[PDB]
Symmetry: C3
Subunit: 430 residues, 3 copies
């Protein structure tokens, strides 16, 4: 069974082979020939074509994915189980993002061993853009300029700079999907159009991901050619330790705390009841393929009713992703600290809004998370070409992210069950 | 019946409350604290967000509205009643626009107490843009530059400046809707797509209009803070007098003159026959909700046949709007004169084309006329932030505009009846 | 039968009348009044409006045409006859384009009697653009800039210049149409949407072509006003001789050579068997209206089976166009040589890719070839206003282009028949 194993596990095997070949190619080139500044640019050309192909696809991706995601989410929510589950999902995703931001600006991996009033208003000025086609490639920014005729008086001058406006497209696609999801039959052709557009965009993303290992091979070789000291391995170790301690103090402290405030039972017996689901999510790395095991572990081991589980588990396997959100926040601030920049209070809120509302805008596909890392890094303006320092270590943390996601919706069943008990009686008598 | 009256009349009541609160807030701020140049900009920030939200929505609005409007108008016109009614509607709308422009440049409310050959060719150069995506945000303009090697010889240099091209989008959406309205079954998916897009855009415009009174509150407070002399109240009085004398000499002189040229009967007995329809259009301010009363007043009081009324009245309640067109022309030139600019012969024809062809491109909705005032002011390049000086007095003239619209299509039934009498005999014998 | 002949042949008659009237108008103006530099620009204004209308329509044209063309081509190919016929079509179109480029840079009609490494990488950088809305109006270009701190070291700086990116739109529409053609039922609304969009775009192109003769009248008058010497008639004669010798050595030498390598029979008896089809394609100038005659001449005169002819002939009448591809390559390099420019090795490959993949992207319509000449001239950045020097002589070469196309797919039936004989036996026994 040699060819079947290659056909089953092509993604992880080809990523690992690309990283190994890129490291040994950069080592064998660095110890055989020097390279000038110009021929260090022609050597990292397939990585440049990959970074162009990844930024090509995010503009149909966020539009189609946000519209169909919030339309299907408006369709799935029916009564009072739906609103409670959705409020729970977005509160825990926001708590995970805030925990990740706090941990990465406190530990600071990557650093070497103005007026905030204007930035927090350019945020709201970028949520409502003045043009919907210019929001696809250019952003707004205001500066304070002094005026000339005893006191010092200024005024505010705004201008449009280059780079895509992700907040404006996210907010307009949210409002547009909520509008066409509520029109009923008169707006079904729009929902079908954007559903087919989302499926076509995910197929093109799969084609780009089939190209990807050649690009990351030449990118990793071009990274380790110019590296002279063994310093960035320490920064990658600290980044992996930051993501792992974020998932550790999110699955152990915060989510049992929420279960103890709401349900007021013992959360650790509940976590011990779901052992086989977490073991399966460690073994196979999908939250949707772990689903029958967590149905079995929440239904017959824990005393959770089936009528609530049937809604909370299959919907929470696709829009409740806490570990991926913590990962994307920590990785975006790590790439920002690696390039010797400083994030303000506008770029941190743009990271925290883009990473929260990307559970909707990833279409529930495992082979798209890299593209989400290009969205967040293009939501604030960072160079995306350091993304190749995260794909090298992604296969070490993917399983732990899956475990944190599955533990999130597994706790969510019990929390939503204890939160609303009147509706089960109302549906049990009639 | 206190809450039902609030649920019925929320628009007018909330606009009036916003104007009153903005005036008393600006008075109580102006007599308690001075404001610098910078903190006069942070105080008028919700108005800036409202003026961004209003300019966000006009680009899907004019595309969807013009395409579905001219497609449904091509569908409604069947024989020779249709062409006569449509030619009548657009001739009277053009006459009302020309009368409004003449009255506002003769009275001149707002003023304080080049080469036209190139501009009239940049008009035609902007009706056919060189790119269809750049027409969504940028315009063309030619200047005359002297050439250097006995006579003085020049040449022409063109460049693209910023701001949306409304004429190019209007002309291309006219041609595109006429094309897909005539393709039959092969172009029905496009008609359904743009119909659903138009309905979604009108729902988002209703959301923006639900936000609107907070924005106009802070805009009116920011207007009357910086005002030192009681001069702009005189200009608002002259603007209201200009709109009222435009509607007065359009409903009394011009439309009975057209009825006397075409029909050669007495128009004033015809106007006295439609008294209850005009009284209802004064009472309730909708031209589509006044429709059964004008059916009754034209059918049984006047001797107008039913077979022509069934087509002229419900189609002319949505695309024949003379009072709104006169209003938008007068208000656009009033905002142009209030900012101490001068309109050429290119901007006046752009105002007269954008205001005429906005009866099609407003989708027949009462809660969208403000957005049309943002289109005309963005068709020529005027600052839209003086729109808040027109919403303060709009509820005084809305009922008179409704009366002029209803009188227009009420005269139109009799004019189209006397114009074509062969078709009624041809459909009466067979 | 005077009015029926005018209704049948309006295109050729109106083009010839426009050329004759433009020449006699330029002669009668040049010998009656001098014209300054400024009034030579107002005289060529309808041609400027025509050249704006032609560039307005190519952006929906290439998108809709490439998507529906490659989707319907993916649908038509079923077994092994389809792949063989498609590979044959694109190999012969590429051979015709290469022959046309070689002949026009060897003969050089139009001439008067950097680093290629960077250009051949900006080609691949423009095939994958960084933004999909900016690909509709702007292109990428890299230059080499020296760096300043013993050897001379440079770096590479890229920037976005104006003009549409045709390679990026062509490649993305190819991949998008291949994706939605393979999704089956889930992507049928996209195929129907782009089919209706393609039909509407071809109707608008027919409207523009109905305007066209007034524009080419004023363009030809403006051309021959400024001409002082009788030199450009010699260049037009050499251009017609270049296109005619390209079609001559493509129909006589190259295609019988391919038939002799593959089939190893006598190709000249095969060409003599199809005499009536070529005579009809000389008489009427359509490759789709010549189709029953070439069915009859290949079926009953030549010994070609019907089961292969039923697929090769009606599909090869619309996507196998060798003469039009040779024509567009020769005409693009002729317009480039007429304006005293020099084409690199990037612009020649952009011409050779845009002209090859425009058989798909012309929607199989005879009244669209002029628009394809605006695409190729806008794929490399040439001034399109010299297109009026090619429409004057197009009706002399259109019939010979039709003959070369028909000879191409007529040889293609026999080549694909001798190439695969196992499938006919497999479908004859079962
Ligand atoms: C309270 C804080 C959280 C607010 C949002 C959670 C959903 C609220 C709600 O009523 O949802 C039910 C409604 C359905 O309404 P309903 O009519 O079923 O009640 O669901 C939605 O509106 C779908 C979710 C919309 C997107 C929410 C996340 C935004 C992310 C970017 C910031
Ligand atoms: C939708 C809206 C989403 C808003 C997200 C806001 C995230 C803010 C994170 C700030 C982190 C930071 O700067 O830490 C610096 C410092 C650490 O930097 P240090 O290096 O000085 O230590 O953080 C702290 O000291 C902790 C601050 C309090 C933690 C919570 C902050 C957010 C509170 C509001 C939450 C939403 C309600
Ligand atoms: C801070 C902002 C505070 C806003 C407060 C608004 C309070 C008034 C609500 C009135 C509701 C009402 O009367 O509904 C009856 C009408 C129905 O009656 P009808 O007859 O008027 O229609 O309901 C609606 O039209 C639905 C509106 C729902 C949303 C209302 C506005 C919410 C706030 C919007 C802010 C701006 C959003 C920008 C969106 C576009 C961006 C692309
Ligand atoms: C004469 C001056 C007015 C010309 C336009 C009026 C309609 C003419 C016509 O034949 O309409 C019937 C045709 C139907 O054609 P038919 O085939 O029924 O005849 O109706 C239309 O074409 C719909 C109206 C098109 C838009 C007209 C207004 C343009 C506004 C911007 C300037
Ligand atoms: C579709 C095409 C639409 C074309 C609309 C053109 C409107 C022109 C209005 C000009 C008003 C003006 O400048 O008035 C200045 C002056 C008043 O300015 P004053 O201040 O010197 O007095 O107007 C006049 O003196 C009256 C001019 C004649 C009135 C009619 C003008 C238009 C004639 C053609 C109509 C279309 C056929
Ligand atoms: C000033 C402009 C004067 C233009 C005069 C045109 C006169 C020739 C009309 C010939 C009609 C004919 O033969 O029809 C038969 C053909 C049918 O026969 P067929 O076999 O050719 O197809 O009819 C059509 O194709 C329909 C064309 C209708 C419109 C004709 C052109 C009108 C003027 C267009 C100006 C430019 C518009 C730009 C539009 C695009 C903008 C986005
Ligand atoms: C070998 C050189 C030519 C390669 C392209 C020819 C088609 C190859 C093929 O497998 O086609 C069958 C496939 C169908 O696949 P299949 O599944 O039937 O096998 O057909 C296509 O993919 C349609 C043609 C795609 C476009 C090809 C031309 C590109 C022009 C721009 C450069
Ligand atoms: C999809 C990819 C399409 C690639 C098309 C490439 C076309 C190249 C044409 C070059 C013509 C030229 O510069 O001629 C100069 C000179 C003539 O210029 P001269 O003026 O010195 O004579 O051409 C030659 O000398 C002949 C060159 C060989 C002919 C074939 C060239 C292309 C070979 C690769 C084909 C694809 C495999
Ligand atoms: C020079 C470039 C060389 C690229 C070589 C790629 C070799 C690996 C192919 C692996 C195929 C595979 O495993 O398929 C199984 C999977 C199915 O198994 P699955 O379970 O992974 O899904 O097949 C696919 O996903 C279909 C992919 C077909 C195309 C594969 C890539 C071709 C090359 C793409 C280059 C970049 C194109 C850019 C497109 C976007 C532009 C807008
Ligand atoms: C580590 C600590 C700081 C975490 C604290 C988390 C809480 C702030 C969150 C987590 C889950 C939240 C709950 C999730 C779901 C709901 C249901 C929600 O229901 C509705 O909005 C009304 C539904 C209806 O009646 O229609 C009300 C808030 C509530 C109880 C939330 C209250 C706030 C909670 C407890
Ligand atoms: C104050 C004064 C200057 C106003 C003058 C207005 C006139 C110039 C307009 C108003 C209504 C117009 C009429 C409205 C409708 C028609 C039908 C229209 O019919 C057709 O186009 C043909 C229909 C067919 O036979 O198919 C011919 C012009 C006509 C009589 C118009 C002629 C010009 C009129 C009288
Ligand atoms: C003047 C000279 C230089 C012209 C040379 C032309 C050749 C390079 C081309 C012309 C037609 C081509 C053939 C057209 C079609 C096919 C079928 C094609 O079939 C497949 O790809 C496999 C189909 C399958 O098995 O599914 C293989 C190549 C082949 C023989 C091509 C081989 C190359 C050929 C002979
Ligand atoms: O549980 C998951 N399924 O798909 C996502 C998430 C973690 N692993 C995937 C990823 O983000 O790569
Ligand atoms: O009669 C009318 N119904 O709707 C329109 C028009 C006048 N009042 C509305 C407006 O334009 O605000
Ligand atoms: O055979 C042909 N039918 O349509 C095309 C091609 C040659 N003549 C047309 C053209 O390109 O103009």
């Amino acid at each position: 069974e040699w060819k079947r194993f290659l056909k089953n596990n092509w993604v992880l095997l080809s990523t690992v082979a690309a990283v190994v070949l890129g490291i040994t190619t950069g080592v064998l080139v660095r110890e055989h020939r020097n390279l000038s500044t110009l021929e260090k640019f022609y050597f990292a050309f397939p990585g440049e074509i990959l970074m162009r192909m990844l930024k090509l696809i995010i503009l149909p991706l966020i539009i189609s994915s946000m519209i169909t995601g919030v339309a299907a989410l408006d369709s799935n929510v029916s009564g009072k189980i739906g609103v409670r589950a959705v409020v729970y999902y977005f509160c825990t995703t926001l708590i995970a993002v805030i925990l990740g931001i706090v941990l990465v600006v406190s530990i600071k991996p990557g650093v070497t061993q103005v007026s905030t009033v204007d930035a927090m208003l350019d945020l709201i000025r970028n949520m409502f853009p003045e043009n919907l086609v210019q929001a696809c490639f250019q952003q707004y920014k205001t500066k304070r300029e002094e005026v000339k005729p005893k006191t010092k008086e200024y005024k505010i001058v705004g201008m449009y700079s280059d780079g895509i406006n992700v907040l404006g497209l996210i907010v307009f696609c949210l409002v547009f999907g909520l509008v066409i999801g509520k029109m009923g039959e008169k707006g079904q052709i729009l929902v079908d159009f954007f559903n087919a557009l989302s499926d076509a965009t995910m197929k093109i993303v799969q084609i780009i991901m089939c190209y990807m290992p050649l690009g990351i091979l030449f990118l990793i070789a071009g990274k380790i050619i110019e590296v002279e000291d063994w310093e960035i391995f320490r920064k990658l170790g600290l980044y992996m330790a930051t993501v792992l301690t974020g998932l550790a103090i999110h699955s152990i402290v915060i989510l049992p705390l929420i279960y103890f405030i709401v349900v007021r039972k013992n959360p650790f017996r509940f976590a011990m009841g779901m052992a086989q689901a977490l073991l399966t999510a460690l073994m196979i790395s999908s939250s949707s393929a772990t689903l029958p095991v967590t149905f079995r572990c929440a239904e017959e081991n824990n005393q959770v009713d089936k009528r609530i589980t049937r809604f909370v588990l299959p919907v929470g396997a696709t829009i409740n992703m806490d570990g991926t959100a913590l990962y994307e926040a920590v990785a975006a601030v790590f790439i920002a600290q690696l390039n010797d920049l400083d994030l303000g209070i506008g770029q941190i809120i743009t990271i925290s809004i883009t990473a929260t509302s990307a559970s909707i805008g990833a279409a529930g596909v495992p082979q798209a998370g890299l593209v989400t890392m290009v969205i967040v890094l293009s939501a604030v303006g960072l160079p995306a070409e350091d993304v190749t320092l995260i794909i090298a270590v992604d296969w070490l943390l993917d399983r732990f992210r899956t475990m944190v996601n599955v533990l999130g919706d597994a706790f969510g069943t019990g929390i939503v069950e204890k939160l609303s008990k009147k509706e089960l009686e109302q549906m049990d008598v009639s």
